[PDB]
From a paper:
In this work, we show that unencumbered views of the changed, non-ground state can be obtained by recasting the problem as a multi-data set, 3D background-correction problem, which allows the relevant signal to be extracted from conventional single-data set density. Our new method—Pan-Dataset Density Analysis (PanDDA)—comprises: the characterization of a set of related crystallographic data sets of the same crystal form; the identification of (binding) events; and the subtraction of ground state density to reveal clear density for events. We demonstrate the power of the method by applying it to the most demanding type of changed-state study, namely crystallographic fragment screening, which attempts to observe in electron density the rare and often low occupancy binding events that occur when a relatively large (200–1,000) library of weak-binding ‘fragment' compounds (150–300 Da, 100 μM–10 mM)1819 are added individually or as cocktails to a series of equivalent crystals. Applied to a series of fragment screens, PanDDA yielded markedly more hits than manual inspection of density, far more quickly and all with high confidence, in both known binding sites and new allosteric sites.
An accurate estimate of the background can be obtained by averaging near-convergence density, in real space and after local alignment, from dozens (>30) of independently measured but approximately identical ground-state crystals. Using an averaged ground-state map for subtraction, as opposed to a single ground-state map, reduces experimental noise in the ground-state estimate and thereby also in the event map. Furthermore, averaging over multiple data sets minimizes the influence of stochastic variation between the data sets (characterized and discussed in Supplementary Methods). Finally, the averaging generates an estimate of the ground state that can be used directly as density, bypassing the need for any subjective modelling and map interpretation. The group deposition feature recently added by the PDB22 makes it realistic to deposit all the many changed- and ground-state structures, as well as event maps (see Data Availability).
Numbering used by the authors: 22 to 142
C-alpha cells in the first residue's frame, strides 16, 4: 500500500535524524569507553551485575536495521549505556566519570533532537 510506503519513509527519515544524533553523542566519548560491548571474556561476572548491556556499536546495528520506532526507544538505549556504567563502576573511576560527562553533554543534543522530531513530525 501507499500508506505503508509513507510510514516507511517516515521511519527512514527518523533513522537519518537518529544517525546524526548518534554521531553527535558518540563524539562526547572521545576516550571510546562506550564504543563496544563490555567483553564477557574480560569481565566474566558482568551479566550478574548488568541485566541489559548496551554500547554504541550495538545501537548502531539496531539503527541500521531501522530498529528504532521513535526517539524514546533510542533514548532508552543511550540511558542504558550511562546507567549501566554508573552502577558497575565506582564514583572515583575514569569509567563512571566518563559516563557523567556523556550524560551531561548528551542532554544538550537530545533536548534539540526532541524538538526536531516533534517539529518535522
Amino acid at each position: 500500500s501507499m500508506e505503508q510506503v509513507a510510514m516507511e519513509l517516515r521511519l527512514t527519515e527518523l533513522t537519518r535524524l537518529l544517525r546524526s544524533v548518534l554521531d553527535q553523542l558518540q563524539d562526547k566519548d572521545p576516550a571510546r569507553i562506550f564504543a563496544q560491548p563490555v567483553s564477557l571474556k574480560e569481565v566474566p561476572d558482568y551479566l550478574d551485575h548488568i541485566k541489559h548491556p548496551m554500547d554504541f556499536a550495538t545501537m548502531r546495528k539496531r539503527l541500521e536495521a531501522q530498529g528504532y520506532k521513535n526517539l524514546h526507544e533510542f533514548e532508552e538505549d543511550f540511558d542504558l549505556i550511562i546507567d549501566n556504567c554508573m552502577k558497575y563502576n565506582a564514583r572515583d573511576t575514569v569509567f563512571y566519570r566518563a559516563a557523567v560527562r556523556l550524560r551531561d553533554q548528551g542532554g544538550v543534543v537530545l533536548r534539540q533532537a526532541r524538538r526536531e522530531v516533534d517539529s518535522i513530525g
